[PDB]
Design a protein around this ligand. Structure first.
Ligand SMILES: [Mg+2]
Ligand SMILES: [Mg+2]
Ligand SMILES: [Mg+2]
Ligand SMILES: [Mg+2]
Ligand SMILES: [Mg+2]
Ligand SMILES: [Mg+2]
Ligand SMILES: [Mg+2]
Ligand SMILES: [Mg+2]
Ligand SMILES: [Mg+2]
Ligand SMILES: [Mg+2]
Ligand SMILES: [Mg+2]
Ligand SMILES: [Mg+2]
Ligand SMILES: [Mg+2]
Ligand SMILES: [Mg+2]
Ligand SMILES: [Mg+2]
Ligand SMILES: [Mg+2]
Ligand SMILES: [Mg+2]
Lengths: 103, 89, 62, 58
RNA sequence: GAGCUGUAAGUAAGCUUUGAUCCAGAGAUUUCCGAAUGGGGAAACCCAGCAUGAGUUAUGUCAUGUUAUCGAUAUGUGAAUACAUAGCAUAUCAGAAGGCACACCCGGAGAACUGAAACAUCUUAGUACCCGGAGGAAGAGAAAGAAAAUUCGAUUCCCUUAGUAGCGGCGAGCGAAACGGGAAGAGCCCAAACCAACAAGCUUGCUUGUUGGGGUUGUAGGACACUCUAUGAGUUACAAAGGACGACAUUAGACGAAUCAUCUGGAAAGAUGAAUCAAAGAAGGUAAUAAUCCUGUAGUCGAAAAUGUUGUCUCUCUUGAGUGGAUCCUGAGUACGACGGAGCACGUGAAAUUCCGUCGGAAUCUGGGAGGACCAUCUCCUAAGGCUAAAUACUCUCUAGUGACCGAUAGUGAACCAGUACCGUGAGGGAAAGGUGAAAAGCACCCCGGAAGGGGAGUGAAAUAGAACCUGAAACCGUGUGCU
RNA sequence: UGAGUAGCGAAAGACGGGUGAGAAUCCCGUCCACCGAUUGACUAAGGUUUCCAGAGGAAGGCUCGUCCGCUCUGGGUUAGUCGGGUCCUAAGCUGAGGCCGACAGGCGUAGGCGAUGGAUAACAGGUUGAUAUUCCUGUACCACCUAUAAUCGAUCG
């Protein structure tokens, strides 16, 4: 269950196997967004903001369950399990290395 | 009370002409009577007024695309003051 | 204004905050748009002051 | 109307003919208006005739 | 535990690790009509009085308390009448009223259509409508019983007895019971004699009315006399009532094991191969069909708070066994009978038992009833006063589930801002209407046209998928055609 | 299908100009006809934004449409004396107590309720795309309040 400052690797998409960072997560539609993944081009018309708006190329949302958070000490993707040490709960990557990949 | 019985002013071309002969318009809360509107502009604006007049608007009908509702009833009040200057702007 | 319970005189503040609230709602119908500092995060404040005054008689009296 | 001790009330039941087809009627109890000694002032009230074990009127 | 500001995109300012928004417990707010209750009233409105207070030099206004009717408790006052009572005046009290799922229950009142091949006794049925009162269950209930052998034992409910004994224009049709097998298992408090005060009459007598205490059954118990026992049992639902000391269950939530690679494809969860967990191969989602991608499951934990079961102690409480029965009491206009009537499966008949109406009307332990009229003998049991858990009947909801149950003319009338549009003055009737794609990527631009639409271009695997949108059958209206 | 068939819900219009992509239908003008104890000017009953301005042409109007009583956006109703409440009662309707009845409830005294009637203080002109005795100009009246001084130990009743 990823956070807003992670750096992950996809499994199944139009562009699979590519890495990248996460910039938003949308936790009611549970669809996250990664740079450089699945560009969806828009035909915006001339609005009151964009002076004579036109075509562009921006990556848009994909689901959570095509995205797996990879091991920082190994760079192989991994299920993340949780345990708690002292006051809070931290993410072990279940490859015996807990990550620090929040910020 | 006496600070929030007046609710909004209204700026209309009926009223913005009626700034010349110094009459103001307002929008008081529905349950008040015309005497204690006079005792409110004494408090809020600190002038003394000659007379006040009120009326009612019945709650006219809403749109049809936006479905069948009614806009809120309201109580437009008009105050008459004979020497107090421009309170609001 | 959050968590200010040790003030014996708040009726100096409620009257002062409420006449502040009327300075802007009356100012809303012409122009002057910054609607956050308008009636949302200020009308909550005059509810903060009453629930820390209305209980104050209650623990006092019985 | 109501008694005192028995609390009487007309209760229903049929009444039949010689060819045995029915109807409805009531059996009203023998009420008599009389003034008795109750607490305070003596009141005048209905009471039934088989409730005669009491001192009448004073 | 990182985003949020409803359903709801767009904004424009903002909030947020100093812990938001959401999830659970607890508290403050709770305008107005409604039993409406200060008087009116066309429900959501109008008019006041009474004290306090703001305010103006005052009058107008405002603000929070306050005042309906029965009922109870206290004084005032108290007529026609003089003694008191109705009546009358103040102060406290919150008892009632209304609503309910009226589903289930208990009493009051109570039809007809229909069957008999018509129809009146009968039956549809003590059913539906109406009204009254309570509960989470109500009613019944501690033998004036069943029975006939040897008796056993409060009530309720399930199976058989059995469509039998029976009732019936002996027609249609109604229709039991005990014995037996089980479910779940508690029995108790008053009345009276007698005794101790209290008051009264009216005296050291008696009677009467209260207060305790004593006492509550039939193998005959109790009063009264005789003799012998006590700080051990019983309990806050029956038996008399309140409350501190201490284990679980609810109302949020944690953790939670196991995988890769290629191929076709817009995209793999599919095919082929190589692996792994398993108290986890329930179920759903993810661009197709996933035990190992996500949410989960099996198994484990958590609870500031607030309620419900409750175990323990603490408290209230409390004497129980025998004999003599030489006297005294055992529920009065009651039980019964006559007269019309309802219920008992039973239509008044050979008609017991049971309650109501009117009218006559007993005896008391050698008593009094009941064993399908009644009398005799023999067995059984003690009415006319009360209280009571469990077995059992229900779901408008709440929690977790299941289905050889439906998949939009089906399923509730109602998947869709449904008892809504809409029709009726009214009471009341009462519809139609689901599906773009994986993702909004919802067609920038060029051209004809005022626009609507349209041809290119463009997104997309697909626009012959264009927001009347998946699939698109028939009636039916059309277009050039081979034969005629 | 009937079928491009019956029907367009009384009646006098004609021309010029303008708007417009489009005009027998919309807007301005002259000429013509039509009611005139009414097709006129006012008030209640009802209806509830239909009212006015600006903009639009899918659907509505028995045709057409540039227009509208239809859609879209933004506005419009001012009262001490005007009708009514803070005054009165009629028919009725409710009705403390009280009668009366299987329950519910029926009837009724005191009192309240109830206008179509009784009582009561205002007019003339102007103004706006829309309101008027309501706002503005002048003129008075009615009820209650305070400061106002020809009398009375007279006033309210
Ligand atoms: Mg939003
Ligand atoms: Mg009221
Ligand atoms: Mg006062
Ligand atoms: Mg058992
Ligand atoms: Mg987990
Ligand atoms: Mg897992
Ligand atoms: Mg008889
Ligand atoms: Mg279908
Ligand atoms: Mg709808
Ligand atoms: Mg393409
Ligand atoms: Mg076809
Ligand atoms: Mg013809
Ligand atoms: Mg012309
Ligand atoms: Mg009207
Ligand atoms: Mg047309
Ligand atoms: Mg319009
Ligand atoms: Mg009268």
């Amino acid at each position: 269950h990823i956070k807003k400052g992670d750096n992950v690797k996809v499994i199944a998409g139009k562009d699979k196997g590519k890495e990248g960072k996460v910039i938003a997560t949308l936790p009611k539609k549970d669809r996250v967004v990664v740079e450089g993944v699945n560009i969806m081009k828009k035909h915006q018309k001339p609005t009151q903001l964009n002076p004579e708006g036109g075509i562009l190329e921006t990556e848009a949302a994909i689901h959570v369950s095509n995205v797996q958070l990879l091991d920082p000490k190994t760079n192989e993707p991994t299920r993340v399990g949780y345990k708690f040490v002292d006051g809070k709960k931290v993410r072990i990557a279940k490859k015996s290395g807990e990550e620090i990949k929040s910020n | 009370e006496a600070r929030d019985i007046l609710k909004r002013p209204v700026i209309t071309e009926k009223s913005s002409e009626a700034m010349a002969e110094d009459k103001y318009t307002f929008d008081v809360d529905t349950r008040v009577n015309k005497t204690q509107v006079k005792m409110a502009v004494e408090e809020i604006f600190n002038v003394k007024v000659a007379s006040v007049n009120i009326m009612n608007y019945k709650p006219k009908k809403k749109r049809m695309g936006r479905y069948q509702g009614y806009t809120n009833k309201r109580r437009k009040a008009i105050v008459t003051l004979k020497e107090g200057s421009i309170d609001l702007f | 204004e959050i968590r200010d319970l040790t003030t014996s005189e708040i009726e100096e503040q409620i009257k002062s905050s409420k006449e502040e609230l009327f300075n802007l709602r009356f100012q809303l119908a012409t122009g002057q748009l910054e609607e956050t500092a308008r009636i949302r995060t200020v009308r909550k404040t005059i509810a903060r002051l009453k629930t820390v005054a209305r209980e104050r008689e209650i623990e006092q009296s019985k | 109307k109501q008694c005192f001790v028995t609390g009487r009330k007309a209760s229903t039941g049929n009444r039949r003919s010689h060819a045995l087809n029915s109807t409805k009627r009531r059996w009203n109890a023998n009420l008599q208006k009389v003034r008795i000694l109750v607490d305070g002032k003596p009141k005048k009230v209905w009471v039934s005739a088989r409730a005669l074990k009491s001192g009448k009127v004073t």
